[PDB]
Design an enzyme around this catalytic site. Structure first.
Site, short mmCIF file in Angstrom:
data_model
loop_
_atom_site.label_atom_id
_atom_site.label_comp_id
_atom_site.label_asym_id
_atom_site.label_seq_id
_atom_site.Cartn_x
_atom_site.Cartn_y
_atom_site.Cartn_z
N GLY B 29 0.80 -1.21 0.00
CA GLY B 29 0.00 0.00 0.00
C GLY B 29 0.83 1.26 0.00
O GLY B 29 1.92 1.31 0.58
N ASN B 30 0.29 2.29 -0.65
CA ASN B 30 0.87 3.63 -0.79
C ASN B 30 -0.30 4.58 -0.67
O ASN B 30 -1.15 4.61 -1.57
CB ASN B 30 1.56 3.76 -2.13
N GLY B 31 -0.40 5.22 0.49
CA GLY B 31 -1.51 6.10 0.85
C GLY B 31 -1.07 7.49 1.25
O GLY B 31 0.11 7.84 1.13
N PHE B 33 -0.34 9.34 4.06
CA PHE B 33 0.91 9.76 4.67
C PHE B 33 2.16 8.90 4.49
O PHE B 33 3.25 9.37 4.81
CB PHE B 33 0.79 10.46 6.03
N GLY B 34 2.02 7.73 3.87
CA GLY B 34 3.19 6.92 3.61
C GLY B 34 2.99 5.59 2.93
O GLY B 34 2.16 5.46 2.02
N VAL B 36 2.77 1.15 3.32
CA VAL B 36 2.44 -0.04 4.09
C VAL B 36 3.21 -1.18 3.41
O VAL B 36 3.17 -1.31 2.19
CB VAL B 36 0.92 -0.32 4.22
N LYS B 51 3.59 -0.01 8.83
CA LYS B 51 3.18 1.28 8.29
C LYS B 51 4.26 2.30 8.59
O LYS B 51 4.58 2.53 9.76
CB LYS B 51 1.81 1.71 8.84
N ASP B 147 -13.23 7.18 9.17
CA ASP B 147 -13.00 6.71 7.81
C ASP B 147 -13.45 5.26 7.60
O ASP B 147 -12.72 4.44 7.05
CB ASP B 147 -11.54 6.97 7.34
C1 LIG Z 1 -5.21 -1.77 3.36
O1 LIG Z 1 -5.62 -0.90 4.42
C2 LIG Z 1 -4.94 0.36 4.45
C3 LIG Z 1 -4.60 0.83 5.88
C4 LIG Z 1 -3.22 0.37 6.35
N1 LIG Z 1 -3.12 -1.08 6.15
C5 LIG Z 1 -3.01 -2.03 7.11
O2 LIG Z 1 -2.95 -1.72 8.30
C6 LIG Z 1 -2.96 -3.46 6.66
N2 LIG Z 1 -3.25 -3.78 5.38
C7 LIG Z 1 -3.20 -5.05 4.93
C8 LIG Z 1 -3.56 -5.37 3.52
C9 LIG Z 1 -3.11 -4.54 2.46
C10 LIG Z 1 -3.52 -4.83 1.17
C11 LIG Z 1 -4.37 -5.94 0.95
S1 LIG Z 1 -4.87 -6.34 -0.70
O3 LIG Z 1 -4.82 -5.13 -1.45
O4 LIG Z 1 -6.06 -7.12 -0.55
N3 LIG Z 1 -3.66 -7.37 -1.24
C12 LIG Z 1 -3.82 -8.84 -1.01
C13 LIG Z 1 -2.49 -9.61 -1.01
N4 LIG Z 1 -1.67 -9.15 -2.15
C14 LIG Z 1 -0.54 -10.04 -2.42
C15 LIG Z 1 -1.24 -7.75 -1.98
C16 LIG Z 1 -2.46 -6.80 -1.94
C17 LIG Z 1 -4.77 -6.78 1.98
C18 LIG Z 1 -4.39 -6.48 3.27
C19 LIG Z 1 -2.92 -6.08 5.85
N5 LIG Z 1 -2.63 -5.80 7.11
C20 LIG Z 1 -2.66 -4.53 7.55
N6 LIG Z 1 -2.36 -4.29 8.88
#
Ligand SMILES: COCCCNC(=O)c1nc(-c2ccc(S(=O)(=O)N3CCN(C)CC3)cc2)cnc1N
Ligand SMILES: COCCCNC(=O)c1nc(-c2ccc(S(=O)(=O)N3CCN(C)CC3)cc2)cnc1N
EC number: 2.7.11.26
Lengths: 350, 350
Positions: B29-31, B33-34, B36, B51, B147
């Site tokens: 992830g790229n959101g 403020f930074g 993930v 994060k 959110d």
């Molecule tokens: C996505 O939420 C944004 C807020 C910050 N993110 C998190 O805290 C967080 N995100 C994830 C997470 C991020 C992306 C996904 S996804 O886009 O479904 N995805 C599935 C697995 N792929 C290989 C990469 C892509 C699935 C889960 C997991 N644990 C976390 N702890």
């Protein structure tokens, strides 16, 4: 085919209804507004768009009142209007018979984006100039569009004519009177709107136009985000952190709320290396925190970026001549009459 | 291949830093403020999310301070936190080591939408109940997520466990103190937010949760639109026109501007015929104009819709047992302790 005959009032001039006959009715849009149809006039064969909206008996329609007052080459003309009963019984529908413009800036920008190409700079100048002319016009009557975005900018691909549409959000902004801050579409909203200002001016359309210019140059929106907070972060990343003074100029109720101290990014690094400097300078001057610091539509029309349009040798890629660009009226020039020295080039008068 | 070793402080408990080693670092992830990242702990093999945000010396991080206070089965856990660098010197980065949850409600809802199917009602109950439990928990500390949307609702497909994430917009709402109205993502914003209210309560999360429920039932967002005005039109189409009293409850600076008089649509016609009546009744009670008229998360958990979850024979389609659903704490029940008579069924606590 099915022929529909109506007694429609002409959009401009005396209130003298006429029998207007049309055929080949197809739906071309469905939104919050209502339904937009395409139809062929039986007399001329000319194509038109018909916007059908449910009318309350409560008051007169604001969009119609605005449409009736307008006559500009860069604005979709209200040809006729009539009343009907369409979908629901015992209820009235107002039908706006408008000029039909075949394409949108949105769809065209999308074609180039998909082909990993950018819209040629000649079209960026043609389309943006024509948008600023339409803005100079409506603004001269105190009217603010309030929903400037690529979907509302119609194009004729053969003639390179742009025409502004959708007067559903349009309102005459009167100083001291409050206005709803929830107008304007995501990506195109001015920071004052994001901050919930109800005291905004017509310079909100200028911010929106600036966002449209930057998007045509980049191939994607300049300030994306699904929330106001994300949009603001993207704005701050380019413009730098707004000053306590700049915050006051937008909305003074958000001065005590702390922002992330990001340096003022150089506008030259925002766009690709090939980007003309006058295009970058134009964005810089339109996308300003302080609403009063933004160029006006008429000043924008006169910017260095549009000089190629004023060249007597300028032509379309298809060989044709450029559409009308210099037929300014007293009304259109009213904000700054001296600008006509730049705006009307020597070769123009005929 | 590359192994990173850090001296990270645990998220909860005593401030006793530990050597944490991790590998297989990929961006997920790229959101706003930074970034993930996903990474594998060398010493368990367990997957985590990291994060990375840029930290200012001016203030402590609000997300970190919120994260450190939380411990709930339906909330992503802050495992560790550490400081480091990533960009051009002098710049300090806060790294939040979080639980990794493999899927999102957004992706899953999208799969079903694409296959022209709807997520089975058992999952709608499991996911929605768990969201309300997480909301009851954060709200009990005066913390508002701000959110709530499908992208911020993480799932384990095998265990049917939902975990709330993204505490970037989260804030402790204190009565009388003003808050930014530009939080919350398009489609999920409560009418008070659309109207630019700075006096909103934690019931904004309830509206958002209600929008998520209706979307899982419909297979598309209930209140779409690219502008506040379009979103409001969609809300009015379902809820009917808000009264001047209802407008006052949301924002009393918009009681003067007149709205389109649309009749109060029957909620039964909104959803498909198969839709359970308790699901419709739940939406009705969550999606209310008057913020105080909305159910609380704990009251929502106790709604008739979730009764199947309280059945002792309930199982997953994969045969497994339902995840933890009844392990309520004093904190979690603090808003209304008598609700535990409905919430904790006889078979729980034998
Ligand atoms: C996505 O939420 C944004 C807020 C910050 N993110 C998190 O805290 C967080 N995100 C994830 C997470 C991020 C992306 C996904 S996804 O886009 O479904 N995805 C599935 C697995 N792929 C290989 C990469 C892509 C699935 C889960 C997991 N644990 C976390 N702890
Ligand atoms: C476009 O936004 C709607 C707002 C009000 N509409 C108008 O003023 C208006 N729109 C149109 C118009 C509607 C749809 C399109 S389109 O989506 O590019 N499109 C190309 C032609 N197709 C056959 C139908 C599909 C292009 C133009 C034409 N004349 C108008 N006068």
């Amino acid at each position: 085919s099915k022929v529909t005959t109506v007694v429609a009032t002409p959009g401009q001039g005396p209130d003298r209804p006429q029998e207007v006959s049309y055929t080949d009715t197809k739906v071309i849009g469905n939104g919050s507004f209502g339904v937009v149809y395409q139809a062929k006039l039986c007399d001329s064969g000319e194509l038109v768009a018909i916007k059908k909206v449910l009318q309350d008996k409560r008051f007169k329609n604001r969009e119609l009142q605005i449409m009736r007052k307008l006559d500009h080459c860069n604005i979709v003309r209200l040809r006729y209007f009539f009343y009907s009963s369409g979908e629901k019984k015992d209820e009235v529908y107002l039908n706006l018979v408008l000029d039909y413009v075949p394409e949108t800036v949105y769809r065209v920008a999308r074609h180039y984006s998909r082909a990993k190409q950018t819209l040629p700079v000649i079209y960026v100048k043609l389309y943006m100039y024509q948008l600023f002319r339409s803005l100079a016009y409506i603004h001269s009557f105190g009217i603010c569009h309030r929903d400037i975005k690529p979907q509302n900018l119609l194009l004729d691909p053969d003639t390179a004519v742009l025409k502004l549409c959708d007067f559903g959000s349009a309102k005459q902004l009167v100083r001291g009177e409050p206005n709803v801050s929830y107008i304007c579409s995501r990506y195109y909203r001015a920071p004052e709107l994001i901050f919930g200002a109800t005291d905004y001016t017509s310079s909100i359309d200028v911010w929106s136009a600036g966002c449209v210019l930057a998007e045509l140059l980049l191939g994607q929106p300049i300030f994306p985000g699904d929330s106001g907070v994300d949009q603001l972060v993207e704005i701050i990343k380019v413009l730098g952190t707004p000053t306590r003074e700049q915050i006051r100029e937008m909305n003074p109720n958000y001065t005590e709320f702390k922002f992330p101290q990001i340096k003022a990014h150089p506008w030259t690094k925002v766009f690709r290396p090939r980007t003309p400097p006058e295009a970058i300078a134009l964005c810089s001057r339109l996308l300003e925190y302080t609403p009063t610091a933004r160029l006006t539509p008429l000043e924008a029309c006169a910017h260095s970026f549009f000089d190629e349009l004023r060249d007597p040798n300028v032509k379309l890629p298809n060989g044709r001549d450029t559409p009308a660009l210099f037929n300014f009226t007293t009304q259109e020039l009213s904000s700054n009459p001296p600008l006509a020295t730049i705006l009307i080039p020597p070769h123009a008068r005929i």
